Amino acid sequence: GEAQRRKEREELAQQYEAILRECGHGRFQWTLYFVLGLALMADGVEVFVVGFVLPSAEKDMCLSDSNKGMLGLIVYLGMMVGAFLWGGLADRLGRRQCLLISLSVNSVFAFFSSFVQGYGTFLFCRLLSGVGIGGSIPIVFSYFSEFLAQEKRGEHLSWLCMFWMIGGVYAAAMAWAIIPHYGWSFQMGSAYQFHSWRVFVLVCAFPSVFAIGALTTQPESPRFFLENGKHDEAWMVLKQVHDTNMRAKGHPERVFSVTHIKTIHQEQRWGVRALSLGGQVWGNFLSCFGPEYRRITLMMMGVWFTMSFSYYGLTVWFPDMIRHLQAVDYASRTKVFPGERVEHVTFNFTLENQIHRGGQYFNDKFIGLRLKSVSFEDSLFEECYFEDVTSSNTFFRNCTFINTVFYNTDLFEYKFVNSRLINSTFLHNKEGCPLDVTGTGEGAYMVYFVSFLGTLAVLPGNIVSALLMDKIGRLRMLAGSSVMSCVSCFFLSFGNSESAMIALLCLFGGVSIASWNALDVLTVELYPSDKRTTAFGFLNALCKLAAVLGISIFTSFVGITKAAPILFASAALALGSSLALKLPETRGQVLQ
Amino acid sequence: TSILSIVYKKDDLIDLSRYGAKINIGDRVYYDSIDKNQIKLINLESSTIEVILKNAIVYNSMYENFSTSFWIKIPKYFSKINLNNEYTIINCIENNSGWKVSLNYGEIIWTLQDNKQNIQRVVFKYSQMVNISDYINRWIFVTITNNRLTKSKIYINGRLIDQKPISNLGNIHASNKIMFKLDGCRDPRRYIMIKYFNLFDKELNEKEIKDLYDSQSNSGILKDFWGNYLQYDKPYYMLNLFDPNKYVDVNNIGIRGYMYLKGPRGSVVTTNIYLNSTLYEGTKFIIKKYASGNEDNIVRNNDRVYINVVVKNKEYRLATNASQAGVEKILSALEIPDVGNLSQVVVMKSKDDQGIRNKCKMNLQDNNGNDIGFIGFHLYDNIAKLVASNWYNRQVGKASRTFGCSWEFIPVDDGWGESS
């Protein structure tokens, strides 16, 4: 029984490879390459949106701690759910069908989140958008693989990873060109406000819609038709590839010589259909953990988890350390004035990064002043008057207020820590958040630039991988890039300034991309066509879970020491490379 | 049934009951100009009131039931010196035996002591961190009943607050002379107001307490926020009882302008002494007499008056166009001479049709004596705009719960101490 079915798969794979060789490489493959590249560009764009809009969304939504982190981590949870779901559904519904459904869901919920005003609703919309976009990479790679001959499969598949970097560059450029315009205050509904980061969200939701539009004009992969017992349309699609390729070549007169293709023999209503689909998907998932594929699946799990953990941890660690260094430099410049006695005189000023200690102000009226990181300590205010006071990161600690009036000020109760107020009046308090929300200004610009630089770092290695994939191999490229990633991880200690962090980020990003390409190609080539999307989606869900874990662990380690992130990244990458070196070789083989 | 009843008379205090209790008053005891029957006692030695009963009415028995009643006004406690500072205000204790009433920070205490030095205490507690208080610097009707067989109970404004058994207490003696002086107060600037002190030789039940409350409430006269009489030619801040976190404000002058409820209110804080809400916010409402023939400045029920409105220390008039869309039509503040025939006249209402005392309400009416309706607020596109409507009258006729037709007048008072 098993031998006959194995022989049938082998002969089907060999005839499919012969047909693909006869059709040849040409315009059809490049058209599908661009379409799936747009589909991958959508995924590449999706991972930057929350990180770029958080500085404005914290003030525009009164976002506290334990809410910014969940917003940052929600896209990966959504991706983890969606990757598994769509990878399971793609082996029973079709690669193109599930890709259209997932991309449409992502587009719809990304459009919905751009107008959402609340936080929990924003969390739900972003989680659903992550679910929609999670299934992009597995389906796209498994869909493009089934149109390539064995002569150049690593090269043509590794060329498909340029669009992820293109999407990252697009996101960085859009953030640089849209977000800094804080003046935009479009008003539709008095209770609601439309800022620039929502426009950025719209522009970042655009490429998924473009991907859907491009994908609507492509045909289903013939291999999925052949596996499911559908022979006529697989022949039609292969023929269409033939005419497109040879018409582009310049010989639109030859005939598709293939007549018959061997096909795998196939052996309340809504609930029954759902139960059948779930059972079949579970069967595919369990057969992924079968006697034939059990060493392979665990080794792939190890490699995916380790590389995802290290990569996402370091990628979230670099900007956090740049911010920490900037904060340390800012706190080093703080001015201190211990003690000052002030008599009747009006006060206007704008003070930044100052601490006034032991002040004694008698009958002082403070009119129209802006405070940024200004702290009054051990001060006494008597018969004072605060009018038109706007403050950020300003606190009154150990202060005593007597007969003072706070008119038209945003000095809320959380800004008086361990203070004593006697006979004081608060009148016409400005509208504001109940707690602190911090403030981000011009320093956003460089952030975009930094992101851009990181994405550009990817550009060289990709080329090299795409130009060398079939020359050395998937295993050797994967190992030789993971080893360099580990070396760059060790080299992290030799940097403590912002420029050093930027250079280190560029080095790591330019080094790890070849390993990621190799893992993608190897995962595509190591599974049968009736389990390719299921296995790829399960491994991608594992990748997203490792991304969550690594991001949390590496962000919890900022400002403490530079040894823990280095140790974690190096150990994980060494384990991943060691596990990857034990994988089988798939170069020079038919797509079985 | 009353043994002691101190009432004001021609420059003295006289006992209404047929006992002729001797009353002597110190040289620093004050009297309010409008309501001389209210007595002010300050924290001094000369600010004293002695009342001497007869030997035949001195409480010396031990099954004898008795009750007391009075009205008290206590200013706000401003600083920590008042904390843990229980001070006696009324004393009838001799040889460590009798009855007494005292005040502490947010507490009114009744104390009974017999010859065996056993103390029984009944306390009424009111907070000071509330946004708007029903007791701070406002008149409070306190009535205390003592049944030697069952219990001793205290009633604030006619409702029971606390009750404690006294069956264990033995024979209670009482002084021949009763005290009215602040005793034991460390605060040198603390005063009280008391009025309408009555004593009865039997335990009052809820019914007689309620009738005494209504009889002494003076239901036919309008009252301000502090419980004092409402007067003409005095600026009052306005408070809505249903929506007490917003104050009356104006934006433009004339018919094109409206007055609305703007919020939120401010706060006055003294770091765990009080966290009250600011009462001196908004626009002042002056009352001008129009048809009241009474010579006094006291605003009585059913008086037909005008309402001036203070905007940037300039006086305008309440008026509305009797003819516009809807029943709930906008009120406006406009120049005094340019009003013409717009509806000005406001009827002041304090008690309902049956005579039950309620808060201050205003009924706008036209020149023809047609009820435009009660004054309140209605929400137009998220703005609480002042409107006169007959919807409130319809609900009153149906005995339904009206929403916003009840107002409160807040004059500036020394017992509140807020900075304007």
Ligand SMILES: *[C@@H]1O[C@H](CO[C@@H]2O[C@@H](C)[C@@H](O)[C@@H](O)[C@@H]2O)[C@@H](O[C@@H]2O[C@H](CO)[C@@H](O)[C@H](O)[C@H]2NC(C)=O)[C@H](O)[C@H]1NC(C)=O
């Ligand atoms: C807190 O204030 C009260 C009331 O004073 C008013 O409010 C102040 C904020 C300020 O604006 C004063 O000019 C106001 O008159 C104080 O209590 C009164 O203080 C005055 C002294 O000017 C005195 O004449 C009154 O008798 C006081 N009234 C009472 C009932 O004691 C209070 O002392 C202030 N607290 C402190 C700690 O000074």
Ligand SMILES: *[C@@H]1O[C@H](CO)[C@@H](O)[C@H](O)[C@H]1NC(C)=O
């Ligand atoms: C602020 O105050 C200073 C002196 O206190 C004065 O010279 C200056 O003109 C003021 N600012 C403006 C804008 O007038």
Ligand SMILES: *[C@@H]1O[C@H](CO)[C@@H](O)[C@H](O)[C@H]1NC(C)=O
């Ligand atoms: C500041 O705090 C210290 C203790 O934390 C206290 O001793 C000191 O009195 C405070 N400053 C003033 C002006 O009271």
Ligand SMILES: CC[C@@H](C(N)=O)N1CCCC1=O
């Ligand atoms: C499409 C590329 C994708 C992948 N799954 O290989 N990449 C590249 C860098 C990180 C990542 O998830």
